[PDB]
Swiss-Prot record:
Residues of the full protein shown: 11 to 205 of 5037
Note: Binding of [3H]ryanodine indicates that the heterozygous channel is activated by Ca(2+) concentrations 4-fold lower than normal. Single-cell analysis of cotransfected cells shows a significantly increased resting cytoplasmic Ca(2+) level and a significantly reduced luminal Ca(2+) level.
Expression sites by tissue: Detected in skeletal muscle (at protein level). Fast- or slow-twitch skeletal muscle.
UniProt name for this protein: Ryanodine receptor 1
Maturation and modification: The N-terminus is blocked. Channel activity is modulated by phosphorylation.
Organism: Oryctolagus cuniculus
MIR domain: residues covered: 65-116, 123-164
UniProt record similarity statement: Belongs to the ryanodine receptor (TC 1.A.3.1) family. RYR1 subfamily.
Protein task: Cytosolic calcium-activated calcium channel that mediates the release of Ca(2+) from the sarcoplasmic reticulum into the cytosol and thereby plays a key role in triggering muscle contraction following depolarization of T-tubules. Repeated very high-level exercise increases the open probability of the channel and leads to Ca(2+) leaking into the cytoplasm. Can also mediate the release of Ca(2+) from intracellular stores in neurons, and may thereby promote prolonged Ca(2+) signaling in the brain. Required for normal embryonic development of muscle fibers and skeletal muscle.
C-alpha cells in the first residue's frame, strides 16, 4: 500500500466496461481531454498542490511532498504541455467539457477528492488504487466518463490515481 503525495507524477484512470481508460490531452492547439486505453506524454499529470478548501479560498482571495487527504482540493498539471486540468465552460447537453487551461488561476483548475465509500473519510490519506470521486470546485460537477468522452456532469464516475 502506497500513499499519494504532491510532486508525484500520476495517470488518472477509470473503467468503461470490460482494459482501462486514462484521462488524456495533447495541449498544443487542442485543449480538450480524451481517453487513452491501456502514451505518457498525453497521460501524465503532476499532483502540483493539495489544499483544504479554506486554504484554497484564502489563496484565491489574496491574488512539498505532502500526502493527499480526502476532502482536499488538488491542482493537476499536464507534465507535457505544462498546462492545468480544468473544467471548461463550453459544451458540444447538461455537462461541461474538461481540458487544459494555460494559467493556473481561478477555481476551474481545482478538483476536490471524495471517498467512494465509508472505507475512506474526509481527512484520511488517499491511497494509490483507491476509487475516488473528483468534484470541480468551479462548477460543482464530477469528472465523468460520458457514454466515449470525458466531461463534468451531475453523474459520478470513480477514478484511480496510479503512479507511473
Amino acid at each position: 500500500v502506497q500513499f499519494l503525495r504532491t510532486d508525484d507524477e500520476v495517470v488518472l484512470q477509470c473503467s468503461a466496461t470490460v482494459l482501462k481508460l486514462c484521462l488524456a490531452a495533447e495541449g498544443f492547439g487542442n485543449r480538450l481531454c480524451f481517453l487513452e486505453p491501456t502514451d505518457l506524454a498525453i497521460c501524465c499529470f503532476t499532483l502540483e498542490q493539495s489544499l483544504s478548501v479554506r486554504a484554497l479560498q484564502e489563496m484565491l482571495a489574496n491574488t512539498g511532498h505532502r500526502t493527499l487527504l480526502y476532502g482536499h482540493a488538488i491542482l493537476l498539471r499536464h507534465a507535457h504541455s505544462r498546462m492545468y486540468l480544468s473544467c471548461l465552460t463550453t459544451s458540444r447537453k447538461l455537462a461541461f467539457d474538461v481540458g487544459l487551461q494555460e494559467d493556473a488561476t481561478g477555481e476551474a483548475c481545482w478538483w476536490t477528492m471524495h471517498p467512494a465509500s465509508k472505507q475512506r473519510s474526509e481527512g484520511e490519506k488517499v491511497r494509490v488504487g483507491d476509487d475516488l470521486i473528483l468534484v470541480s470546485v468551479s462548477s460543482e460537477r464530477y469528472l465523468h466518463l460520458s457514454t466515449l468522452q470525458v466531461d463534468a456532469s451531475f453523474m459520478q464516475t470513480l477514478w484511480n490515481m496510479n503512479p507511473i
